[PDB]
Every structure is written in C-alpha cells, then in structure tokens.
C-alpha cells in the first residue's frame, strides 16, 4: 500500500486471534501493545518517551499479521496510550518513508 | 498533540 | 528520496540557519525539536506521548527545510529527548509510508 499522513497511519493487526489497532511509527524502535496475556517468557524492560519512561514486558519471537505481511519479532507489553509498531517490525514487511 | 516516539 | 528504516529514520534540516538532525516520525501528530530560540510570538502549548504530558512553546508559520524539501508550519519547542518531525510536517514535504 501507500499510507498518507493526512491522519494517524492506523492499521489492523492480528496477534493470535486478537485483533487490535495500532500506529505505524517510524519514530519507534520498538513495538509495543497494550493489554495483553501473551505467551512464554518475558524480560522487565524500560522505554522511553516524550514525557518519561514506562515499563513494559518485552517478548520475544511473536508472531503479528500487519495487512496480511507475516512479520515474527520482539513485541513489548505495557500501559502505552497508543498500540504501536515500530521499526523492529516495519522492516520485516518492507515499509519504508517515500517523498 | 500526541507525539509517540519510543526509545527502546 | 527512500529511506528505509533498519536504523532511525535522522535526517537533516534547516531552520534559522541552523543545521540539526531530526527524526522522520510518523507516531507524532506534530513537530518538535530540543530548546532553542524561535522568533515571533509563541503560545504555551502542552502535548503528551508514551510517557505522559510535557510544556512547549508552539510557533506557528515556520519555515524548515527537511533534506532539501521546504515547509512552512507549526513547530513545537521543549524537552523533547529528539528532534521529531511530525506528520504536519511530512504531509507539506510529500512523505508517505509504502510497503
């Protein structure tokens, strides 16, 4: 596809047969989701924003569908405000910033 | 006025 | 140009004469960069990401330049841990998200 930035590049994902929202974000390293039980061992971790530092549950090897692209990486869990892909995943479906 | 970079 | 995203999208702008690097962010509804002096009048503004809200200064009508490509709008100063381009920004310039 091309996604224009007119409004928030929101897009379908499908983790395990939950299927959420989230922001496809080049400004992020990582991926991160909120609520969510999600199998396996997990890792405390930190990440930072504008406005501080939240703690997250990182997982590792986590399978996510992002308009019908397969992509399996690190996802972490936590009270973001906003579900998020980052780009630890956006490379793995081959997207990249055109102008 | 909502800004999400993430530095992991 | 393409810019692919195994590492952050930075690129260099210009504003006031001034040379900085930024990040190509489309997780930001707008742009901001670390303190520095603006001209014109500015409203305090307040504005909030993954964790929590932060103050600002919003100055309206700015031109930047984002490699090479002019824009003219909204820039939002303060303690920002980068300087992020937003989509108010990226839309001006023609940038669009493909996979």
Known sequence: PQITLWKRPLVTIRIGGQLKEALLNTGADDTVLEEMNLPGKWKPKMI???????????????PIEI????????????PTPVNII???????????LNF | ADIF???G
Do not use: M, P, S
């Open chain 1, 48 to 62: 930072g924003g504008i406005g501080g530092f939240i703690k997250v549950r990182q997982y590792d090897q986590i």
């Open chain 1, 86 to 96: 980052g780009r630890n995943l956006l490379t793995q479906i081959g997207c990249t």
């Open chain 2, 5 to 7: 970079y993430l530095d």
């Open chain 1, 67 to 78: 308009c019908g692209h397969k992509a399996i990486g690190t996802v972490l869990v936590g």
